Amino acid sequence: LKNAXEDAXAELXKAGITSDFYFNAINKAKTVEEVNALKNEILKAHA
């Protein structure tokens, strides 16, 4: 059910990101909207 953590996790694993700020933002993100926003932004930026 709550896969939006491991999705945003594995995707940023695949994208090759290891930046502490975005990791903190992603894991601190309590709402999935933030997760989608952060992930889609940085993923598109590192696609």
Swiss-Prot record:
Region (GA module): 1-47
Location of this chain's protein in the cell: Secreted, Cell wall
Highest taxon listed in the record's lineage: Bacteria
Known function: Binds serum albumin.
Name the UniProt record assigns to this protein: Peptostreptococcal albumin-binding protein
Organism, as annotated: Finegoldia magna (Peptostreptococcus magnus)
Parent-protein start and end of this portion: 219 to 265 of 387
